[PDB]
Amino acid sequence: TVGAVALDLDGNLAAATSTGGLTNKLPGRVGDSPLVGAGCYANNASVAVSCTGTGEVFIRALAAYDIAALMDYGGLSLAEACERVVMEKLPALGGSGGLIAIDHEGNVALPFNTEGMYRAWGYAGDTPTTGIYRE
Amino acid sequence: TVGAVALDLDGNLAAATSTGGLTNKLPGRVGDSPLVGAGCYANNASVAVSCTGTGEVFIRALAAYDIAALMDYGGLSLAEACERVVMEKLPALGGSGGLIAIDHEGNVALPFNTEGMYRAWGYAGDTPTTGIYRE
Amino acid sequence: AVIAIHGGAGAIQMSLQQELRYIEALSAIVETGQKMLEAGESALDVVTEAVRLLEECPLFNAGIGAVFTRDETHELDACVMDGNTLKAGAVAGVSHLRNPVLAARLVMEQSPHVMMIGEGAENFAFARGMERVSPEIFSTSLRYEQLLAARK
Amino acid sequence: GKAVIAIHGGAGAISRAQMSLQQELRYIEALSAIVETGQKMLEAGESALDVVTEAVRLLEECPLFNAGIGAVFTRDETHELDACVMDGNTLKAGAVAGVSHLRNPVLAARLVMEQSPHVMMIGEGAENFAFARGMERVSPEIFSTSLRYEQLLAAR
Ligand SMILES: [Cl-]
Ligand SMILES: [Mg+2]
Ligand SMILES: [Mg+2]
Ligand code: NA
Ligand code: NA
């Protein structure tokens, strides 16, 4: 699974997710990656999210839109919504993985509950940061 | 599309949606009906929803989970959440259709913004109500 | 304890006796679901059976009486979700399964997956003894006529 | 708010006690080159939607990542690819699942968003829609890498 989230100079949010799925996967199995609000969501009012992990749980918990709904309706910050979703609700359902999120206000978050998440981010005009492990 | 939502004597919620899709769809087209939180959602913490209508808008608006999220995070009643989703947000995106919803306390709602929605409901040990047109 | 069902929303022209076929259908299915709830059947079994009956009923755009694709074929989609476990099962783009909601339930019950598509979905079902059917069995005069009308 | 991109190439038990520093740096330079390309587009006033499409196209192309080229294998030793893209502006979205003959699923997803009235297409239908919009057909074997095949054999 791979993903991208962006906030542009127009203040537009977008999200993309692509995957080959799971090694040895049962043919015809679909995880969260192609499913709007499971593995991929973007709304100028809230957040752009792309997800990676145990796709069944990301679907059941509608992880991507749940970030959006926690922020928009719950009044959570991106940080709060990310913690709630990735560190609490997804583990609660036996979901492992993480996601990348940018909100309408230009906050970026890259939560994961796994050992690693191949990730990077950068502000336009700034030096980018890359990561694999925690810390 | 057809649908069912139920609350059982154990206080459990379930939802189901089945459909042929939209007449004259491109082969390979998927609407909201098989998409968790688009056309079908159930959570004992909130609500069981099954949807019918412009599937593309139901997916983009994540209609079913948005009822759940408006109730659970927004503190709306089922009625308020149904009105907000079906009568405001789905039309706002040019979505036409409706849905059936039962909340964890056994409140039932059958909103639609179309001319008709083939529908019925009935409390266990009570006589059922059927409908086609508005009211 | 309570059930609701729907047979689709849209631009619903009609006589009382035409309307009453839809009403008697809806009434019989909601009543079947009502009886199960009263008898202590699970919400998940009740919504499965109601939607299975709505599939079987040729009046409604699900299983028998499905709309047609542009290629005059049927491609059916279903979902079922258990609000207790938050388990869900779903099939999309299946043409050889009489009751997509039963296929969905099978995906929920006898895989670790939530969604299966197309021949993968079908082979999964066949492998667990669900019967293969030819897509022609869903075909009705009324939905074909609506396809011709959609063309113009 | 001020313009920004994030990318990922998947979460999992990526463990230090399996990866060498040299392996880790290939992942870091990959991530770095792609986020920088996305950063240059944002700075140049390119849209979030164009920026996330290109970043994911680059992540698909990169065989280090389980998307497009370097996709894992199914039980049948096939590739089945899935993508979504969503435009936060319009709330339009496009998605493919179960596609084996489209080099860049995220481009197919974009095509579903931009040149159909649908949000999601699956399988041969997804592919025929894409071919009929002039997207090129490819061999499923182009995504096949020695690494992912070996991982399949190790899983079984
Ligand atoms: Cl009526
Ligand atoms: Mg641009
Ligand atoms: Mg490969
Ligand atoms: Na039917
Ligand atoms: Na790749």
Numbering used by the authors:
A (entry chain BBB), B (entry chain DDD): 179 to 313
C (entry chain CCC): 4 to 15, 19 to 158
D (entry chain AAA): 2 to 157
What do the study's own words say?
The Escherichia coli enzyme EcAIII catalyzes the hydrolysis of L‐Asn to L‐Asp and ammonia. Using a nature‐inspired mutagenesis approach, we designed and produced five new EcAIII variants (M200I, M200L, M200K, M200T, M200W). The modified proteins were characterized by spectroscopic and crystallographic methods. All new variants were enzymatically active, confirming that the applied mutagenesis procedure has been successful.
The determined crystal structures revealed new conformational states of the EcAIII molecule carrying the M200W mutation and allowed a high‐resolution observation of an acyl‐enzyme intermediate with the M200L mutant.
